[PDB]
């Protein structure tokens, strides 16, 4: 029939701020699937509110040999400046070596008919991720 489980609620991981712009806003989400504990599915949420619709957005990353990285198919190289739907990209990472490393986030796009290049490294990652 139908049966849940016996036990208290776990402790998930709250979003993480990596990039904040007067118009653009990027958020980081960590997912830890039960089937694969050593697997870390990271997600990105780039929102645009400014009066300049973004296009041809490029999202890249970098990880140390120890870990792995998988670039999944995007959703669209276009972001609505009218609070529409942001872009999301899936990235698989293997941390079986039990080594809590960091992740690099490379951003490259065009805004207001101008070149927008900003690179940063998320060093304020949560402990639960590896722990």
Domain CATH for 63: 2.60.40.1230
Distance separating alpha carbons of residues 86 and 60, to the nearest angstrom: 16
d(CA 23, CA 128): 31
Spatial separation of the C-alpha atoms in residues 120 and 122, rounded to whole Å: 7
Q: Which domain does 74 fall in, by range?
A: 1-131
Experimentally, the structure was elucidated by NMR
Q: Are 56 and 77 in contact (CB under 8 A)?
A: yes
- With 0-12 CB in 10 A as exposed, 13-18 as middle and 19+ as buried, what is 131? exposed
Phi-psi region of 56 (alpha: psi -120 to 50; beta: other; left: phi over 0): left
Place of tokens 């402990």: 127
Kindly provide the residue ranges of all beta strands, DSSP E only, lying in the chain, ordered along the sequence.
16-20, 24-31, 39-48, 54-62, 70-71, 78-79, 91-94, 103-110, 115-122
Tokens of 95: 């941390």
Count of structural domains, the chain: 1
Signed CA dihedral, 8, 9, 10, 11: sign only: negative
For 37-64, letters b (16+ CB in 10 Å) and e give eebbbbebebbbeeeeebeebebebebe
Q: How many CB atoms lie within 10 A of CB 80?
A: 14
- The three-class DSSP label of residue 60 is strand
The residue among 71, 69, 72 whose CA lies nearest residue 94 is 69
Closest CA to 62 of 117, 28, 101: 101
Beta carbons of 87 and 107 less than 8 angstroms apart: no
- Give the Cα-Cα-Cα angle 121, 52, 19 (nearest 5 degrees): 15
């Amino acid at each position: 029939g139908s049966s849940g489980s016996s036990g208290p609620p776990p402790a998930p991981i709250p979003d993480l701020k990596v990039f904040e712009r007067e118009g653009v806003q990027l958020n980081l989400s960590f997912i830890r699937p039960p089937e694969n504990p050593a697997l870390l599915l990271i997600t990105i949420t780039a929102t645009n509110f400014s009066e300049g619709d973004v296009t041809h957005f490029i999202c890249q990353a970098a990880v140390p040999k120890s870990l792995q990285l998988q670039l999944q198919a995007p959703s669209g190289n276009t972001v609505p400046a009218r609070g529409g739907l942001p872009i999301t990209q899936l990235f698989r990472i293997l941390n079986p070596n039990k080594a809590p490393l960091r992740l690099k986030l490379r951003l490259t796009y065009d805004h207001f008919h101008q070149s927008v290049q900003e690179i940063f490294e998320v060093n304020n990652l949560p402990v639960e991720s590896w722990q």
